[PDB]
Design a protein around this ligand. Structure first.
Ligand SMILES: COc1cccc(Cl)c1CC(=O)N1CCC[C@H](C(N)=O)C1
Ligand SMILES: [Zn+2]
Length: 139
C-alpha cells in the first residue's frame, strides 16, 4: 500500500484504489496502473521533473529503503492477476531489487522529488509506475 499526496490530489495504484478514490475520481489509466483522486487537505509531497535513472525506493516487505538504477518509462509486458488480464503496462520503469505484491504504493524518489510508485515485480526485479510526465499534478 502507499500513496502520493500532492496539493489537492492523491495518487495511488489503480488496482488498490478505494470506493472513496473512485467517488472523488480525477483521472485513471488502467494501462499505467494509476488513479488520481481529489482531497480536501493539502498534500505533503513534491514531484520530480527530470530524466533521473537513479533513486531510492521504500520496500515495506523489508521495512527498508533501497538505492536503485531504473530504466526509462516504457511499455512492458505484465502477467495476469486478480486485477488485470495479461497486457503491456505503459510508463513503467524496471530496477533490480526486492519486491512482493504488498509492496505496491511504495514511493521511488530521486534528489528532485517523487518519481513514482511500486506497481509490478518478480524474480529480483521491481517495476515503478512513473508520474513525472503528469505536469497537471502541480497546477
Ligand atoms: C510489486 O509487485 C509484485 C512483486 C513480486 C511479485 C508480484 Cl506477482 C508482484 C505483483 C505484481 O507484479 N502485480 C500484481 C498486482 C498488479 C500489478 C500490475 N499489473 O501493475 C502486477
Ligand atoms: Zn531526478
Amino acid at each position: 500500500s502507499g500513496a502520493i499526496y500532492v496539493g489537492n490530489y492523491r495518487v495511488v495504484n489503480r488496482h488498490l484504489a478505494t470506493h472513496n478514490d473512485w467517488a472523488n475520481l480525477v483521472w485513471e489509466d488502467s494501462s499505467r496502473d494509476l488513479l488520481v483522486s481529489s482531497t480536501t487537505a493539502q498534500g505533503c509531497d513534491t514531484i520530480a521533473r527530470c530524466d533521473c535513472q537513479t533513486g531510492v525506493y521504500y520496500c515495506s516487505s523489508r521495512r527498508k529503503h533501497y538505492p536503485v538504477s531504473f530504466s526509462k518509462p516504457s511499455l512492458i509486458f505484465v502477467e495476469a492477476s486478480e486485477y488485470y488480464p495479461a497486457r503491456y503496462q505503459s510508463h513503467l520503469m524496471l530496477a533490480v531489487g526486492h519486491s512482493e505484491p504488498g509492496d505496491c504504493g511504495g514511493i521511488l524518489r530521486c534528489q528532485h522529488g517523487v518519481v513514482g510508485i511500486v506497481s509490478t515485480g518478480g524474480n529480483g526485479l521491481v517495476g515503478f509506475a512513473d508520474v513525472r510526465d503528469l505536469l497537471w499534478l502541480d497546477e
